């Protein structure tokens, strides 16, 4: 089915500019629209879309209305300008979904065999790569529940396209690019420890929280099964590197040698050619 999806910044702003529509006029709920996808392969891609008037009552938390007259004719408007472009599902800005979303997806399954909902974020905050992707399947359950429809998380990645970077990448203008080789890798090292060890601390605190309350999730079993894959080496004090110690510096072997050897020749290029060219102009000027 659908493994991964690709969300462009263009369709994302089509959710954001509609937040300026219902934001100034109010009132409740959020931005909800129909998503126009493009399927050239198992990987899913999204280019454009169209926002539809949508409302969801609170009380009455399960009440939702799509507009099919706006869904029908405008599709033919977009089908005429773009033939390959078609609706792959719907979307919304969340941030957190509600149980009623089982009815929104099941109603539009007449248009598409599988509708993929995209939860986006209008204001970026935390903790990382934004928005979200969900796919609608039926896993039933191990406990004996009736057949259950639960949206499974789909990995989402942003992507670019030709001619769309004209105004987009121009308006920012404030970023330093890239710069690969100096600050690019070392900044992420401070981030991969930050973002890596905070979700670590966040999850281990939730694992302790599972003992107190919140059982189920049992999970099961993905919690500890994937944790033990991390446990191939812990690493614990100290590092158990007795076999990897003499190999450690052995990886630093070529790195230090190429450093000292080339820098000595780079110095021979820097020192010699400078003193030559400097002694030339200096003493011959006066």
């Amino acid at each position: 089915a659908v493994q991964k999806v690709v969300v462009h910044p263009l369709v994302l702003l089509s959710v954001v500019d509609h937040f300026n529509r219902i934001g100034k006029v109010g009132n409740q709920k959020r931005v909800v629209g129909v998503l126009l996808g493009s399927w050239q392969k198992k990987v899913l891609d999204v280019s454009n879309s169209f926002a539809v008037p949508f409302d969801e009552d609170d009380k009455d938390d399960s009440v939702w209305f799509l507009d099919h007259d706006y869904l029908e004719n405008m599709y033919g408007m977009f089908k005429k300008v773009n033939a390959r472009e078609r609706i792959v599902g719907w979307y919304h800005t969340g941030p957190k979904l509600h149980k009623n979303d089982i009815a929104i997806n099941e109603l539009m399954k007449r248009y598409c065999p599988n509708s993929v909902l995209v939860i986006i974020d209008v204001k970026p905050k935390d903790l990382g790569l934004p928005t979200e992707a969900y796919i609608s399947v039926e896993e039933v359950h191990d406990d004996g529940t009736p057949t259950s429809k639960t949206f499974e998380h789909v990995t989402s990645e942003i992507g670019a396209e030709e001619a769309e970077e004209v105004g987009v990448e121009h308006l920012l203008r404030d970023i330093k690019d890239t710069t690969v080789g100096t600050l690019s890798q070392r900044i992420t090292n401070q981030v991969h420890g930050l973002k890596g060890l905070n979700s670590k601390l966040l999850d281990i605190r939730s694992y302790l929280e599972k003992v107190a309350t919140g059982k189920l999730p049992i999970n099961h079993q993905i919690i500890y099964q994937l944790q033990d894959v991390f446990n191939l080496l812990p690493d614990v004090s100290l590092q158990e590197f007795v076999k990897a110690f003499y190999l450690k510096t052995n990886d630093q072997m070529v790195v230090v040698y190429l450093a000292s050897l080339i820098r000595s020749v780079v110095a021979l290029h820097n020192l010699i050619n400078n003193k030559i060219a400097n002694r030339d102009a200096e003493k011959k000027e006066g």
Partner: protein
């Protein structure tokens, strides 16, 4: 079962877009029989053909669309 007429209007307007495709070609082509299916790399299947021109260029377009490949030899 009354959606026929509204659906029959778009086939004539698309044919009206074929009627602007009727007028008017500056190009005449020679036909080449071809069968092409590319596995990726979910699956894209179909048939394509090779297209010459009177200007000596040779173009590439999928199997027509309208008249199918049942007729004829190139």
């Amino acid at each position: 079962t009354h959606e026929l007429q509204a659906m029959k209007d778009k086939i004539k307007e698309n044919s009206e877009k074929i009627k602007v495709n009727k007028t008017l070609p500056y190009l005449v082509s020679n036909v080449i029989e071809l069968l092409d299916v590319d596995p990726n790399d979910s699956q894209r299947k179909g048939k394509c053909a090779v297209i010459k021109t009177s200007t000596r260029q040779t173009y590439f377009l999928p199997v027509i669309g309208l008249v199918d490949a049942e007729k004829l030899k190139p």
